[PDB]
Amino acid sequence: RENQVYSPVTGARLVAGCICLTPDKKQVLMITSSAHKKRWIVPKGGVEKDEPNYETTAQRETWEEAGCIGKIVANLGTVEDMRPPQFENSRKDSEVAKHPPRTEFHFYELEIENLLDKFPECHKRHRKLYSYTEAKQNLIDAKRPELLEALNRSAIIKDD
Numbered sequence: 001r002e003n004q005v006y007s008p009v010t011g012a013r014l015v016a017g018c019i020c021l022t023p024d025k026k027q028v029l030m031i032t033s034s035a036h037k038k039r040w041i042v043p044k045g046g047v048e049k050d051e052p053n054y055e056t057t058a059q060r061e062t063w064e065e066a067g068c069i070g071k072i073v074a075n076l077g078t079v080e081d082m083r084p085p086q087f088e089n090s091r092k093d094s095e096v097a098k099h100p101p102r103t104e105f106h107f108y109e110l111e112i113e114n115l116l117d118k119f120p121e122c123h124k125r126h127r128k129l130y131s132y133t134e135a136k137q138n139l140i141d142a143k144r145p146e147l148l149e150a151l152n153r154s155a156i157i158k159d160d
């Protein structure tokens with residue numbers, strides 16, 4: 001139902017989520033897409049009308065989707081799903097035809113404080129820690145470069 005919030009400018013869906021890291025920052029928590037059941041992504045979901053801020057949405061989604069609790073330690077800013085629902089070539093480069101973003105993502109970095117075995121989606125998703133290299137490859141395999149950009153902005157140790 002239309003409890004969902006949209007950018008008054010672009011019409012993009014507003015979504016918040018978490019890059020969840022281990023205290024030592026060597027791993028990131030990933031979950032399986034419910035739709036695309038073999039794609040590994042990060043916890044996120046739609047902002048609802050009642051929610052006062054993006055952090056609220058981000059921590060709600062991180063609990064509901066991954067059973068993960070912790071503390072927001074950084075604002076990672078915004079990224080856009082630029083997937084289209086066909087090309088235009090500018091002489092030394094080529095691009096997809098102009099369209100509004102599907103989704104504007106507000107990401108936060110979270111330091112994991114607990115992972116619980118029971119959570120709302122624990123029967124609908126898998127959840128696993130990954131090092132930077134494996135996480136990067138997951139997000140390429142999932143076709144989600146915008147979630148990789150959010151990961152890259154995080155304090156995750158990349159020197160593997």
Ligand SMILES: O=P(O)(O)CP(=O)(O)O[C@@H]1[C@H](OP(=O)(O)O)[C@H](OP(=O)(O)O)[C@@H](OP(=O)(O)O)[C@H](OP(=O)(O)O)[C@H]1OP(=O)(O)O
Nearest residue numbers: 013015032033034035036039041044045046047083102103
């Ligand atoms: O229910 P919420 O969490 O509040 C809201 P969502 O944003 O979490 O639910 C997502 C939504 O599906 P739908 O609206 O039908 O529920 C997306 O469709 P789109 O953004 O194009 O409108 C879909 O992205 P796409 O890959 O199909 O393009 C995404 O799959 P993905 O996991 O990100 O790959 C779904 O996430 P899942 O929670 O199912 O994993």
Ligand SMILES: [Mg+2]
Nearest residue numbers: 044045046061
């Ligand atoms: Mg949701």
Ligand SMILES: [Mg+2]
Nearest residue numbers: 044045046065
């Ligand atoms: Mg979601």
